[PDB]
Amino acid sequence: LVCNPWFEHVSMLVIMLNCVTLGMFRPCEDVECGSERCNILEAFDAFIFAFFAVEMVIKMVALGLDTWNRLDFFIVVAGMMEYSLDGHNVSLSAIRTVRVLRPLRAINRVPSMRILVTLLLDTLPMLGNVLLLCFFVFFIFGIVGVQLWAGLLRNRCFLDSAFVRNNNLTFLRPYYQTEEGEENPFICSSRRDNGMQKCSHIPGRRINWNQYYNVCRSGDSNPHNGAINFDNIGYAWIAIFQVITLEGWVDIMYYVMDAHSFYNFIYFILLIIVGSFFMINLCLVVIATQFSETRIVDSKYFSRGIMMAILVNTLSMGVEYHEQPEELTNALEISNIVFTSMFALEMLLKLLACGPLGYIRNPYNIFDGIIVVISVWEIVGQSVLRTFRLLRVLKLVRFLPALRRQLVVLVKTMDNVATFCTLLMLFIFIFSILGMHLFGCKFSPDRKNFDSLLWAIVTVFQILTQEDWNVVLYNGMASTSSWAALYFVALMTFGNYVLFNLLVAILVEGFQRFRVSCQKVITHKMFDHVVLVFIFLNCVTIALERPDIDPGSTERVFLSVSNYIFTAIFVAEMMVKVVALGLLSGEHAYLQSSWNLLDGLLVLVSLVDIVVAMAGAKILGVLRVLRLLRTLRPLRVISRAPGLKLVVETLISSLRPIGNIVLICCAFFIIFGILGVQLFKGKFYYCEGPDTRNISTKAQCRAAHYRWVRRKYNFDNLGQALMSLFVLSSKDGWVNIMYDGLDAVGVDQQPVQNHNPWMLLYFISFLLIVSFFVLNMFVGVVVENFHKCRQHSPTRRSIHSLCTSHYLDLFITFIICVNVITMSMEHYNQPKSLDEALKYCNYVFTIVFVFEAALKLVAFGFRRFFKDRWNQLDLAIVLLSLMGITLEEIEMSAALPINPTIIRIMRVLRIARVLKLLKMATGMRALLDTVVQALPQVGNLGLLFMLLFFIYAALGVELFGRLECSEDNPCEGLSRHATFSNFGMAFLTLFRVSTGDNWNGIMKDTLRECSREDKHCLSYLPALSPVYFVTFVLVAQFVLVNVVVAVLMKHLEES
Ligand SMILES: CCCCCCCCCCCCCCC(=O)OC[C@H](COP(=O)(O)OCCN)OC(=O)CCCCCCCCCCCCCC
Ligand SMILES: CC(C)CCC[C@@H](C)[C@H]1CC[C@H]2[C@@H]3CC=C4C[C@@H](OC(=O)CCC(=O)O)CC[C@]4(C)[C@H]3CC[C@]12C
Ligand SMILES: CC(C)CCC[C@@H](C)[C@H]1CC[C@H]2[C@@H]3CC=C4C[C@@H](OC(=O)CCC(=O)O)CC[C@]4(C)[C@H]3CC[C@]12C
Ligand SMILES: CC(C)CCC[C@@H](C)[C@H]1CC[C@H]2[C@@H]3CC=C4C[C@@H](OC(=O)CCC(=O)O)CC[C@]4(C)[C@H]3CC[C@]12C
Ligand SMILES: CC(C)CCC[C@@H](C)[C@H]1CC[C@H]2[C@@H]3CC=C4C[C@@H](OC(=O)CCC(=O)O)CC[C@]4(C)[C@H]3CC[C@]12C
Ligand SMILES: N#Cc1ccc(Cn2ccc(NC(=O)Cc3ccc(C4(C(F)(F)F)CC4)cc3)n2)nc1
Ligand SMILES: [Ca+2]
């Protein structure tokens, strides 16, 4: 019965049988319960539920009155309720959702997956300190958000009530809305605010009604069918949660910049730094520590000949592109024959030298043999075996022992990844079925739908990548209810929790006479400090450059002369140093260090700039190239600051251990790049027009007077494929590239939705494989740091007793906690009754804190009380609170000598009372202290991070400073808020690119061709744009990785 293993094996079979029936659910074909197919499936379910009841009875009888056993009971009890409740039509459908817990029974049946889930549950209790930090971020920013922006996103430009009445016309729509509709609302700034969007910015008619929408007042709905707003703490947390995921966070920012103030970016910068970066990466640090505590053939020249023969053949496959000349196609086929014969000859020579049994004795010769026959089969059989010619690159592993040793290391990591993958596939399946029940056939149909198991799994997988997940959120919120946000919050929170544990698992298994004067000047202690001043001043000059400076303005003269002065200063510095040290003769010569070589090249470029500028000559093309090299001057700061020099040298040395993983990843990119070109070249064209459902070919598009256009990210050649693959790997806009590959039909054919669903394998295989390599690169950097780190008064006494006792602290904690609850009840258009109640509560809290200060003064004495920092903090809040009440009362009275701006700030600043709770949080303070101890390392990397922004911010203004956006030339990433028009705006744009939020949209705007009528075009900008964004994205993320490592190592050593 229970003491035999076969009974469990029977239980496992039935558990798997349920998973099949659950996946067969059809949301809008099974809910009506009409089809015979549904009838048998429910019969199947009834059969299985009967066994699950029997299994309990036998086990209950055999053991009598373990978490997993309790789970078995809970599932059946709920199942019995649903099963027995049949007959009552009230909420019967809403009760069938309990069937999705059944696959959880497979956890206990599989031993390995049982042990893993035990560790996951045992690690949870030690995340309480991080969870407490999460509450502080959400509540501090949640309250600040509501008090600032409550009800502002309902603003719309309305018609005047008198205007519509007196003119006796009501055909106009009440408020201005774009032709698109309410999905692109025009949020205006009220009269009592200074938002960036006013009703005077409405475009004119394209018979002048748009100029009569001149009153800005609250509307009826918020953006996205009411999903995005700050009307109460409940909605402010959804906006804060979406920002922390870095998905569509700029859009939320732009809404409040239009409605409230431009300086609201400070709110979203701190939230991303504090909430997105530190608070999410502290989860990884805490788990990481906790988990740790818990005669001719054999010749070298012959081998080299084959090695280069394979390499040329593999690269020759990348010369394919869309419109190949037929002679080029033939050359590739002739080339295939030559290389095919060469490998065939090789097998013959080796077979004779060792014989068939000797030849088979080595696995690699077997692998090489199989390729030859398939390749020969292809020639004799003259598109299925053309794709298999990509396997020829795998032969290079034999000749690359260093790379071969890395491949086995990665493979050994996949033994413990498989355990987590099995848990994640079960995790995805449960949420895919759960979504089908909640949102099945209700997103009326969007491609991101839960209408079937295939696209429910794809949608759930997409949310885990955090790509357009907010689009799915708004659909779920609008269709069923606003509480549907908990489906996505639990899916993301639980999914990222499991993926951190996979990263930690790999880490732990990884741990297991004039010349005399010059010599004196350069050796002077103040030499670097003096030159560092001039370098800093040059930065101010570079940052003032922008395209809108008039050639004849005074500023242009100021900037132009400063260039002559600065170039003169930095040649003298080089000349003085060169004379002192010598150019290259002596051992201490000038060119014996790279940091000196860099300085010389910058000086050389500056001199050439003067020479060219001195030319009244056809040197316009060369001049623009020199302007780009003038933005690298700020690189001279690194050598002058010893802190920067050390960190910069540390990052370079960190790339050595992961050099081979990068090579394997780069080889992977080319292999998949070539494969994509063969599949998708010439098929990413489409017809662009208002009514295109009737078009099916290029010819019909021309007839309908539409335009036949190509996607920005395509696979027309290996150059275009590599750009597309990088956008996939970054997981920003990777769904749109996938859709194009799914819809591809052929050359000159209109793409059709979901034409080839089998292409999901191509795009989802690249995402997983590239993510695996990037996972092992992070582990490679950490392990290296670990290895190198380890190698290296009768009445007064009674009051004094009370203050010393813990009773006062517990009382204070209660008072602040209730003050926390009352601060969350504020919302837009709250009743006046609640206003008075909240105001009265403020009086009680202020009085309590005043008594709190008085008693401590009595107990400890004036100076001794003041010594404690916490006591100082207590005084500030009491003092701060007293002024807030005073300004509130006087303003509420007849006299009005105060600005409603000051009253708002004092109202907002009462959020500081939460800091009194930080005193009780001893565990949280220790967690914060770990970061505070890493500042010397994190501080220097921050300077490198801010230097990286300066160089690319100044380089962006030069390249993309003149791009325009208009209805004639629409743009997808750039807007009124995202531009490179000046250094100040380029800095904000790169911060968005740093977080990866629709950075692929910005790149598109730089790849789109120049107008035939416009001037100041740059013909090869499309070639330079991919380099600009690719390098910044890789470099910006790598620096942040080294910040995470610096904190991680300190937390390990600190224990
Ligand atoms: C650390 C704190 C938690 C962080 C988790 C972040 C994600 C939070 C998302 C949960 C909030 C979802 C509810 C949003 C809300 O309050 O407003 C919706 C609701 C209106 O719903 P209708 O669609 O019917 O609107 C039509 C109106 N006739 O608004 C309300 O009625 C307000 C009731 C709730 C007040 C806000 C407090 C909610 C408590 C949230 C706790 C969630 C914890 C999750 C960890
Ligand atoms: C060494 C660096 C880090 C010093 C600090 C950076 C400054 C040089 C930046 C920060 C703010 C920037 C300013 C922000 C806004 C403007 C307004 C704008 O000037 C205009 O002509 C107004 C717009 C218009 O013409 O309609 C663009 C330049 C300027 C002065 C920017 C010039 C460069 C500034 C001063
Ligand atoms: C080779 C690996 C190791 C490194 C990556 C190098 C790539 C960036 C190179 C290799 C092959 C190159 C391609 C070789 C041939 C062509 C065809 C050439 O065709 C045309 O000019 C298009 C004519 C037309 O169809 O109208 C355009 C450049 C392109 C795609 C090249 C772009 C740059 C590529 C992809
Ligand atoms: C390997 C990963 C990390 C990506 C590395 C950066 C690539 C995205 C860069 C490197 C070289 C770039 C290419 C260099 C030259 C050009 C110019 C131009 O080439 C063409 O002529 C193709 C278009 C045509 O057929 O007209 C268009 C962009 C392209 C292919 C670039 C596209 C982006 C590329 C592939
Ligand atoms: C302290 C933390 C753990 C939150 C829980 C405390 C509750 C006592 C507070 C938090 C937010 C408050 C809500 C904030 C906003 C609103 C909306 C307000 O107006 C509406 O019903 C608006 C309906 C809509 O437009 O969706 C009614 C009171 C209510 C539910 C409040 C009731 C009291 C709530 C739930
Ligand atoms: N100032 C500033 C600033 C602040 C925040 C932002 C946006 N951002 C948030 C986070 C972030 N990067 C990082 O955490 C660095 C990192 C990248 C990948 C990993 C992985 C995995 F865990 F992901 F798999 C193991 C491979 C770990 C660490 N960037 N941008 C600029
Ligand atoms: Ca995105």
Side-chain angles (χ1 to χ4, degrees), residues 536-546 548 555 950 981-985 987:
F536 169 81
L537 295 169
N538 212 9
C539 297
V540 166
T541 308
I542 296 161
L544 289 170
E545 191 72 4
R546 63 198 179 284
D548 78 50
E555 187 169 10
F950 193 103
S981 61
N982 64 49
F983 189 93
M985 272 333 270
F987 220 104

Side-chain angles (χ1 to χ4, degrees), residues 702-766:
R702 307 317 309 290
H705 289 45
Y706 293 159
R707 33 181 310 108
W708 189 256
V709 80
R710 189 181 66 174
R711 301 282 178 183
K712 300 300 185 212
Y713 302 130
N714 58 63
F715 297 84
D716 278 4
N717 58 55
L718 182 59
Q720 297 292 338
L722 287 170
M723 200 177 15
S724 307
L725 291 184
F726 187 88
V727 177
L728 292 167
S729 69
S730 68
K731 295 189 286 286
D732 182 285
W734 80 268
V735 169
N736 297 321
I737 305 177
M738 181 171 88
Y739 288 166
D740 305 338
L742 291 160
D743 306 350
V745 174
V747 290
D748 312 32
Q749 306 297 121
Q750 182 75 357
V752 173
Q753 169 158 333
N754 292 329
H755 173 70
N756 195 351
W758 281 107
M759 294 309 222
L760 290 167
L761 303 172
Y762 178 92
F763 297 102
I764 298 174
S765 300
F766 189 74

Side-chain angles (χ1 to χ4, degrees), residues 363-496:
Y364 298 105
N365 320 339
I366 294 171
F367 177 73
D368 171 333
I370 215 73
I371 264 49
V372 157
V373 295
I374 307 184
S375 34
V376 172
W377 164 302
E378 214 257 323
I379 301 157
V380 178
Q382 183 170 9
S383 60
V384 181
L385 304 182
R386 260 194 139 254
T387 279
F388 277 56
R389 311 207 297 222
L390 289 168
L391 297 187
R392 297 177 185 172
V393 71
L394 281 176
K395 298 150 176 227
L396 299 178
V397 306
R398 151 201 297 290
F399 315 111
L400 278 35
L403 178 123
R404 182 149 35 61
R405 201 167 19 265
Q406 188 66 46
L407 252 54
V408 57
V409 153
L410 294 169
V411 154
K412 271 294 149 230
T413 304
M414 236 177 300
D415 63 8
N416 95 75
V417 170
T419 320
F420 278 88
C421 292
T422 297
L423 181 60
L424 213 35
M425 299 186 189
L426 182 66
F427 173 106
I428 292 165
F429 181 73
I430 288 165
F431 274 91
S432 307
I433 303 303
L434 173 60
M436 268 156 74
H437 284 284
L438 300 181
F439 315 116
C441 215
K442 299 185 190 171
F443 291 2
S444 61
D446 196 352
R447 287 166 151 281
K448 284 141 172 120
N449 66 59
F450 298 88
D451 297 2
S452 66
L453 190 63
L454 173 55
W455 298 112
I457 294 166
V458 171
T459 304
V460 167
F461 173 80
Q462 176 201 317
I463 294 156
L464 290 173
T465 71
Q466 311 181 170
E467 167 63 8
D468 288 317
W469 84 270
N470 63 295
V471 177
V472 196
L473 169 72
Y474 306 147
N475 271 329
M477 260 180 128
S479 63
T480 54
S481 173
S482 86
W483 292 96
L486 296 175
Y487 173 92
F488 304 89
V489 173
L491 167 53
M492 314 254 298
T493 288
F494 292 17
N496 292 345

Side-chain angles (χ1 to χ4, degrees), residues 134-135 138 232-235 237-238 241 477 481-483 485-486 489:
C134 171
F135 282 3
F138 269 78
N232 63 65
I233 201 75
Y235 280 120
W237 282 345
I238 295 165
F241 184 83
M477 260 180 128
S481 173
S482 86
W483 292 96
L486 296 175
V489 173

Side-chain angles (χ1 to χ4, degrees), residues 743-935:
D743 306 350
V745 174
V747 290
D748 312 32
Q749 306 297 121
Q750 182 75 357
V752 173
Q753 169 158 333
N754 292 329
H755 173 70
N756 195 351
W758 281 107
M759 294 309 222
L760 290 167
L761 303 172
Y762 178 92
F763 297 102
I764 298 174
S765 300
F766 189 74
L767 253 61
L768 295 167
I769 300 164
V770 153
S771 305
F772 177 77
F773 296 145
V774 173
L775 180 72
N776 283 274
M777 270 145 46
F778 181 90
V779 166
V781 176
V782 171
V783 168
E784 193 240 14
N785 284 278
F786 183 68
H787 288 340
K788 211 134 64 153
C789 187
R790 78 169 200 121
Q791 288 175 351
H792 180 70
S793 296
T795 310
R796 162 178 166 265
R797 196 70 177 182
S798 55
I799 292 165
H800 181 289
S801 182
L802 195 282
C803 297
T804 303
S805 185
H806 72 276
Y807 304 146
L808 190 66
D809 285 341
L810 275 285
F811 185 59
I812 277 278
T813 292
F814 184 65
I815 291 290
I816 306 154
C817 289
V818 86
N819 191 189
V820 165
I821 290 203
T822 62
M823 254 183 294
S824 310
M825 298 189 210
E826 297 77 352
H827 55 283
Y828 176 63
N829 264 16
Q830 68 194 23
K832 169 54 38 43
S833 146
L834 191 55
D835 260 343
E836 305 316 17
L838 294 177
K839 169 174 28 63
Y840 296 150
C841 292
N842 192 38
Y843 293 146
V844 178
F845 303 146
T846 317
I847 295 163
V848 152
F849 299 150
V850 165
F851 292 161
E852 172 289 340
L855 268 72
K856 285 172 162 172
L857 260 283
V858 168
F860 307 126
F862 297 83
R863 190 168 65 173
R864 197 205 244 180
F865 158 91
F866 193 107
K867 171 150 247 300
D868 194 7
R869 260 173 211 302
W870 297 110
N871 286 335
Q872 302 172 355
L873 158 68
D874 282 310
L875 184 60
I877 275 66
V878 172
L879 171 136
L880 188 86
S881 202
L882 287 186
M883 336 192 315
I885 273 186
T886 302
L887 284 102
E888 189 88 308
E889 290 299 327
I890 298 185
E891 197 78 340
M892 158 72 162
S893 304
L896 310 166
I898 309 140
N899 211 254
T901 295
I902 311 303
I903 200 136
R904 171 62 58 62
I905 293 332
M906 212 52 33
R907 267 269 312 231
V908 166
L909 272 202
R910 83 183 47 202
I911 186 44
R913 302 166 183 176
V914 170
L915 267 40
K916 298 173 133 265
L917 271 167
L918 211 62
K919 193 166 36 59
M920 164 273 216
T922 40
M924 206 204 144
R925 285 161 53 203
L927 215 81
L928 291 165
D929 172 330
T930 279
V931 193
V932 177
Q933 296 276 289
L935 273 282

